[PDB]
Amino acid sequence: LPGDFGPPRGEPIHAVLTSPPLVPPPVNRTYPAKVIVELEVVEKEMQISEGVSYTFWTFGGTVPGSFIRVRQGDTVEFHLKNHPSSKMPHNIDLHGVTGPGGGAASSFTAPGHESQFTFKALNEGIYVYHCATAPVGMHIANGLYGLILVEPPEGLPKVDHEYYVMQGDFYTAGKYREKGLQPFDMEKAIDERPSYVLFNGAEGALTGDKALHAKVGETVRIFVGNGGPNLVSSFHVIGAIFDQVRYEGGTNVQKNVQTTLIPAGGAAVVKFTARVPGSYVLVDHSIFRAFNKGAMAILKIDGAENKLVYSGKELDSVYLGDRAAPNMSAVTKATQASVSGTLTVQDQVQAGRALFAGTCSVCHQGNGAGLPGVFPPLAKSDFLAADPKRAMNIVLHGLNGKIKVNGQEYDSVMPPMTQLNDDEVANILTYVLNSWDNPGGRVSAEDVKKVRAQ
Amino acid sequence: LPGDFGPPRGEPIHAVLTSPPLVPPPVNRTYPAKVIVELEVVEKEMQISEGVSYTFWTFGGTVPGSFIRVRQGDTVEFHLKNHPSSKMPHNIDLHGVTGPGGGAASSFTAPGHESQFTFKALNEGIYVYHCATAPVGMHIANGLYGLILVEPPEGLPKVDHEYYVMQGDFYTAGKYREKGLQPFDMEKAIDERPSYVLFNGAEGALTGDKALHAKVGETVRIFVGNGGPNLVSSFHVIGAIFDQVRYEGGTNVQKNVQTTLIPAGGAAVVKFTARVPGSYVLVDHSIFRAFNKGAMAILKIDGAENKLVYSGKELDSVYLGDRAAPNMSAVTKATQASVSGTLTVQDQVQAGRALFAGTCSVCHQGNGAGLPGVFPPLAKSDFLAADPKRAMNIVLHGLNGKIKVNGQEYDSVMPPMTQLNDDEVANILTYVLNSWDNPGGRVSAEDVKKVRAQ
Amino acid sequence: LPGDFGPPRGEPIHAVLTSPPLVPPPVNRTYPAKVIVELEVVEKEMQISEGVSYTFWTFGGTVPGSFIRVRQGDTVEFHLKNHPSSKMPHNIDLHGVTGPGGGAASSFTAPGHESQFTFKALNEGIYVYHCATAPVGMHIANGLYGLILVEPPEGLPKVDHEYYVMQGDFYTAGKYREKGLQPFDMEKAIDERPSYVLFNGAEGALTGDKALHAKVGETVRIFVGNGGPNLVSSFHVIGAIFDQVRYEGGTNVQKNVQTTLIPAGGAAVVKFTARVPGSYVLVDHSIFRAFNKGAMAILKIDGAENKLVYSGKELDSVYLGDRAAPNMSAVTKATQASVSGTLTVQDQVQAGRALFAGTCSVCHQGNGAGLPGVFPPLAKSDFLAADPKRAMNIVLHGLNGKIKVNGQEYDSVMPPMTQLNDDEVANILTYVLNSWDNPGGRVSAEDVKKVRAQ
């Protein structure tokens, strides 16, 4: 058999697991060991987006689940606990396991119970693990997946940073960015029509102040999973190249590629060398996923510019939209205040400020000045002030034809933005009304609901 | 030109074709030959699922079509017959053919006719063949695809077993497991929204008593096709690894991978070495295909357990659901009895028994005992007996909140199972009512139809 | 850094860009240069299909955009102009650029403006470029993508022909082949449900009289892009094989494959050697794309037949359908005449003639004779003449059961063809009525609209 390095030696090792986006240290070991792995399933509400709650099913309290790191030839004694608060039974199938179900039958664990099974890690490589409990698709869709690394006996080459990034497709009853606790939607899941496509279980999980970091000249290894359940990632780094891409434990290594297809349930190790400073975007290049459903993550490189290599500027809201900023905490706060019935004008203003970035600023500018004769101003806009209800219709349904704004004619097209939710339109317009010498007041979600219906 | 091994020598060879999942023997030949291939298109009803009929269009009476095996450098005289019972014209495009349409124009065959054309097999490799008749997508969707192997001149390395597995996506007017003769649905096909995703033309075609077999220590080669028409397979073996994956006649060979993307119209040769006994599941790891639409096949390995490699148990209904069992013949029988108007309580009981596995047993257990205080019993259930109509509502629409069953409180969540068809709910509940000291009687599909509508 | 060939030498080079499907000449240069690239965004209506207009956003007036060809180690001074007629701002992200956004922030260009940035081409390979302006998916969906080749320092091996082919998915409010100016459909785009899947921005862009050409014995290199935004191409050549497939600047080269997966945003260089004459079809082998949404392109090879390799005939309308013919200009003319209110019987006849190929002729024959007792005649058809309204119902809704046509019984199935638009049914039936001694007259789109509604 492969991984024939003899019986376990030394002492039993209690595996130290890490939460995304971090990785356990290299095993740094020349002998096979008995490794004891303890992983606990926890079902809990978390924010899938600002003001959007979801009942996740998690391995270790995170999506993706805790990272497991062992050595080819190790004997793994795998313990799965199911927290007493769980409503569902759970189990595990680890890719890389030699045996039926990858552990599934022997890891069946009711709420408040523990199971264990033992396997030899015969196969080096990076591998997806996931729940294997009927209905399997529901369990995986709710977040039950992670990565296990089985190192080659000599270890992977040294790098400056190792990170853990895992794509998933998610299925909410509500539409993208519709607030509240969103149930799982079985019909969307069966049709492979996700409402969100995410890295690490949430919109913005790896953007802004949650970005990954490295410095010019450093090497970065990323362990990239695709939990699915259903989508295949056109996995891509914007503005860079992968030195290496290696799938699972494959003998093949692709070098010097920017775009690479990761199967549903697949995993790859990618290597990046930082050359010039700025934000490098990991995306699913099935572009509506990346830019309309949340499938973007950032590796931010600090260090000296090299104008001979790249003369240009850091990413901004034109490309990254409302994820250019450190966070959108104001949207969470405004949503909470709406639930509590304490929503203030300033709550709306700060939420709208966050949402205006990219969505509106690409044309109207961050200062609302637009571009005379090309993009009309929102700053001190007579046309806006004259009819706040018209402004709701313009955001939802677009605007075209000749108009006059602050004494100048425009004859252009503002596309409809019907995908914005009632609260988003209300908060954006309240921000605009309370900025740039506009007349103040507020737009409510209910105001926008009425315009959308007629 | 490649395959330049000279003119055909020896005697003309009448190719012996095989039905899935079997493969013709190695050609075992050191000279190029004239190989005569005879393939007949037959249009006929077959069961795509238990009690679900479909009008398949087949090469050789099977989906996928008969397997063709020749040697690089052979001259192939290809004869296509279209059975007189056919309503449609048919033809063939074989991948690996050097020439326009891969044979399409010269193989146009009306019902009751025969065509022939000759090609040299210049290209070694495994290749999809399919019908190439307008509307091409309709012909392929109805099952008109198979594999042709063009061996390298020295032959493939010897293995213990060779099998033939081909994925397809299928488009029925009715939903998944809706009984009766299901028309092709053009609108679902254009939108790439299949109702079934299958190996070898049916649900359960390669599960249970139809599984592929090998023994511990043996090598298994699988010729894997993806007929499409539309889907790309995240092709995966649960609980194992592929020693090798080779696409078409590619120079590249990937080794030691578990998950591999097979394009629509693509084919690969995979190699497996049996290490420990049990069921190894071939899936499309776009998971809702595998677990909600039929895309699972089994390679069952017999032999001695090795607890040092894997301590765990064989697959069961928790993972495989209602395909853990040898077959679901009872569902076919009950459906037939419904059509004939002779449906008995015991017909329903046996159909429900088959469908209860995984679907209900994952939580309620195979004996209906559940888990006190966690999963309420269906065995001798006062709550079930008290209101059979409520039980229909619970299966369709779920149940949550505090309830009392057999003297114990539950406060958990049973998800809705609205995807079950009226007959499936009726048969499952009739099985439960006639098991475990429950009060007997029956639930009808019409009973369930009324609850679903209100 | 890679591409470390020193500072630019010689004179600054003004890059000569080419329109699809042509490629600039090899750079044929042994020193690194400063290359000045000028690319202008133009928003304009073009025909996405005959009689179907679309507002494309283009780099250089074409979809895909102008081809850029430079040498690894070059310093590229990139100038982006946005034509004054533009309504939207635009920018660029070139894959292969080392720097944040691949140029996006520094190339933001309002209508009537110009931007520039400088990058070193460190990375050899074929790369997608695309617009990177919020909403990014909308910009890409409207056609803003192309290819940049960064040659290795020694150049690519010499071939007889180099061509430029780029797949895209498109999202119209109307259905496939519904006439008129079709708006972008955001809801279809978010759901990844394209109405058209095309090579080079239109149906028939590379078919018939727009086919690519080469001769027997010649080598053809194709630079293949996938602009997306959303789809992954099961990229395939019908009746041939790729000698080589190389993705982006990857070290890996696959040889001797026919079917290859191109990620969304991906690019590959493929090599073909012409062996026998005829039409070789480039398709997305997700077959409904290729045969129902426009995803087919032709490389037509002229030269001597070799009956030892392939005895068969050139492609015809059975496989290629209504794209077997040089063009479908008659459909454009008839659509124009309908708009102008000058639609004649002969306008309809010529449009119907073009649309009858494959769609109807596969069964009824190009001469309408059918096959006695198998496919009933449309030529001098008593059954057709007897009830023109029935003929509309038959095309839309199909026909089955026993009928009598010209004295002979038929007992077969004509599938429904509801996907044909009202004008297409009207024009096809007007062609049939005015051919083969049929009674003449005409069917109007309004006639067909009424039958479809009842």
Ligand code: HEC
């Ligand atoms: C460029 C693609 C735009 C984006 C994104 C947004 N707007 Fe816009 N807007 C745009 C144009 C070209 C026009 C004029 C259309 C015409 O008929 O010529 C407008 C118009 C408005 C108006 C009314 C005029 C004014 O007060 O300046 C409002 C109130 C407005 N737009 C608001 C707005 C908001 C809030 C946006 C984000 C949700 C937004 N616009 C995006 C161009 C573009």
Ligand code: HEC
């Ligand atoms: C776990 C995910 C479950 C699956 C799968 C099925 N059931 Fe269930 N069921 C489950 C729970 C946790 C509960 C109690 C909910 C609560 O409010 O606490 C139930 C309840 C029932 C009942 C009513 C109570 C009883 O008689 O025990 C019935 C009749 C019932 N469930 C039937 C049933 C059938 C037939 C299933 C397969 C179609 C099925 N359940 C699946 C948990 C789960």
Ligand code: HEC
């Ligand atoms: C084969 C798959 C067919 C294609 C494609 C089309 N037609 Fe057809 N048609 C076909 C059959 C087998 C039948 C007879 C059905 C039966 O009940 O036996 C028909 C019938 C007609 C008729 C009526 C009979 C006649 O006049 O011959 C008409 C007017 C007709 N078909 C027209 C038609 C047109 C215009 C098509 C392209 C849009 C078309 N058919 C396609 C088989 C097939």
Ligand SMILES: [Cu+2]
């Ligand atoms: Cu689970």
Ligand SMILES: [Cu+2]
């Ligand atoms: Cu898996």
Ligand SMILES: [Cu+2]
């Ligand atoms: Cu056919």
Ligand SMILES: [Cu+2]
């Ligand atoms: Cu094909």
Ligand SMILES: [Cu+2]
């Ligand atoms: Cu743009």
Ligand SMILES: [Cu+2]
């Ligand atoms: Cu890109």
